Design an enzyme around this catalytic site. Sequence first.
Site, PDB file in Angstrom:
ATOM      1  N   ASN A  76       9.419  -8.637  -7.931  1.00 44.43           N
ATOM      2  CA  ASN A  76      10.280  -9.246  -6.956  1.00 44.43           C
ATOM      3  C   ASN A  76      10.211 -10.763  -6.918  1.00 44.43           C
ATOM      4  O   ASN A  76       9.338 -11.304  -7.243  1.00 44.43           O
ATOM      5  CB  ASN A  76       9.871  -8.621  -5.693  1.00 44.43           C
ATOM      6  CG  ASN A  76       9.791  -7.037  -5.703  1.00 44.43           C
ATOM      7  OD1 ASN A  76      10.746  -6.379  -6.212  1.00 44.43           O
ATOM      8  ND2 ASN A  76       8.673  -6.405  -5.344  1.00 44.43           N
ATOM      9  N   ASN A 117       5.505  -1.112  -3.885  1.00 44.20           N
ATOM     10  CA  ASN A 117       5.386  -2.568  -3.830  1.00 44.20           C
ATOM     11  C   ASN A 117       3.873  -3.150  -3.782  1.00 44.20           C
ATOM     12  O   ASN A 117       3.386  -2.437  -2.876  1.00 44.20           O
ATOM     13  CB  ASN A 117       6.373  -3.085  -2.805  1.00 44.20           C
ATOM     14  CG  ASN A 117       6.685  -4.763  -2.905  1.00 44.20           C
ATOM     15  OD1 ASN A 117       5.820  -5.364  -3.149  1.00 44.20           O
ATOM     16  ND2 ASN A 117       7.824  -4.853  -2.227  1.00 44.20           N
ATOM     17  N   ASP A 175       6.725  -4.123  -8.222  1.00 42.86           N
ATOM     18  CA  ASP A 175       7.081  -2.674  -7.939  1.00 42.86           C
ATOM     19  C   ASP A 175       6.442  -1.663  -9.051  1.00 42.86           C
ATOM     20  O   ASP A 175       6.732  -2.314 -10.253  1.00 42.86           O
ATOM     21  CB  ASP A 175       8.494  -2.246  -7.760  1.00 42.86           C
ATOM     22  CG  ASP A 175       9.164  -2.975  -6.585  1.00 42.86           C
ATOM     23  OD1 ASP A 175       8.321  -3.535  -5.641  1.00 42.86           O
ATOM     24  OD2 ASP A 175      10.249  -2.724  -6.254  1.00 42.86           O
ATOM     25  N   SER A 180       5.494 -10.362  -5.513  1.00 43.25           N
ATOM     26  CA  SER A 180       5.212  -9.079  -5.520  1.00 43.25           C
ATOM     27  C   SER A 180       5.806  -8.227  -6.447  1.00 43.25           C
ATOM     28  O   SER A 180       6.782  -8.575  -7.451  1.00 43.25           O
ATOM     29  CB  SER A 180       5.241  -8.280  -4.462  1.00 43.25           C
ATOM     30  OG  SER A 180       6.690  -8.112  -4.103  1.00 43.25           O
ATOM     31  N   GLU A 228      14.970   4.759  -9.094  1.00 45.47           N
ATOM     32  CA  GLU A 228      13.889   3.436  -8.908  1.00 45.47           C
ATOM     33  C   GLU A 228      13.461   3.501 -10.509  1.00 45.47           C
ATOM     34  O   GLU A 228      13.014   2.043 -11.002  1.00 45.47           O
ATOM     35  CB  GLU A 228      13.002   3.945  -8.088  1.00 45.47           C
ATOM     36  CG  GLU A 228      13.170   4.092  -6.429  1.00 45.47           C
ATOM     37  CD  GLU A 228      13.348   2.650  -5.947  1.00 45.47           C
ATOM     38  OE1 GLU A 228      13.288   1.582  -6.790  1.00 45.47           O
ATOM     39  OE2 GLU A 228      14.085   2.620  -5.143  1.00 45.47           O
ATOM     40  N   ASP A 277       9.387 -12.635  -4.452  1.00 45.68           N
ATOM     41  CA  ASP A 277       8.530 -13.204  -3.664  1.00 45.68           C
ATOM     42  C   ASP A 277       7.088 -13.198  -4.230  1.00 45.68           C
ATOM     43  O   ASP A 277       6.188 -13.579  -3.757  1.00 45.68           O
ATOM     44  CB  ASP A 277       8.308 -12.357  -2.239  1.00 45.68           C
ATOM     45  CG  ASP A 277       8.015 -10.825  -2.324  1.00 45.68           C
ATOM     46  OD1 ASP A 277       7.736 -10.427  -3.378  1.00 45.68           O
ATOM     47  OD2 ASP A 277       7.642 -10.385  -1.286  1.00 45.68           O
TER      48      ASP A 277
END
EC number: 3.2.1.17
Length: 128
Positions: A46, A59, A52, A50, A35, A48
Amino acid sequence: KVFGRCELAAAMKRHGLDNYRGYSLGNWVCAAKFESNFNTQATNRNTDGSTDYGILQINSRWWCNDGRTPGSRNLCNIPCSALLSSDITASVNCAKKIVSDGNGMNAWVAWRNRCKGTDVQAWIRGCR
Ligand SMILES: C[C@@H](O)CN1CCN(CC(=O)O)CCN(CC(=O)O)CCN(CC(=O)O)CC1
Ligand SMILES: C[C@@H](O)CN1CCN(CC(=O)O)CCN(CC(=O)O)CCN(CC(=O)O)CC1
Ligand SMILES: [Gd]
């Protein structure tokens, strides 16, 4: 902070991740490696809108407030910036909520693709 493997394993154990919802410590260390590369300061946007955040790439869509994910939730009741801390307490407490939500560690795409069904014990081998 960029953690060593055993340093992170020891921190995650101290905060009660080993066998949390049945996931042995090596699952968590493997997830963190793929990760974030054990980097608390990792961020990834991301498609959309958002983002991380942190060692377990939590998220902002659901889990934290970054002030720029409109109509998002803040279910860990934390600023996303708290997930970038050298202290992994916030990340670990929020991860406990996620892994508890019914989907287990499948919430972490890198865990599903790179850790699930592997020898995860290898990630804590050699650590005291
Ligand atoms: C303790 C040594 O292993 C450290 N290591 C020495 C060199 N290694 C030798 C080897 O890994 O057998 C080759 C490169 N190595 C490949 C890998 O590890 O996957 C990546 C860099 N590593 C990452 C790590 O090991 O945590 C740090 C340096
Ligand atoms: C070159 C070696 O690193 C070979 N290595 C196998 C033996 N390693 C040795 C070690 O990491 O000290 C122990 C397990 N290792 C822990 C870790 O990497 O943090 C996870 C699996 N690794 C992933 C990787 O290295 O990127 C696969 C290749
Ligand atoms: Gd390795």
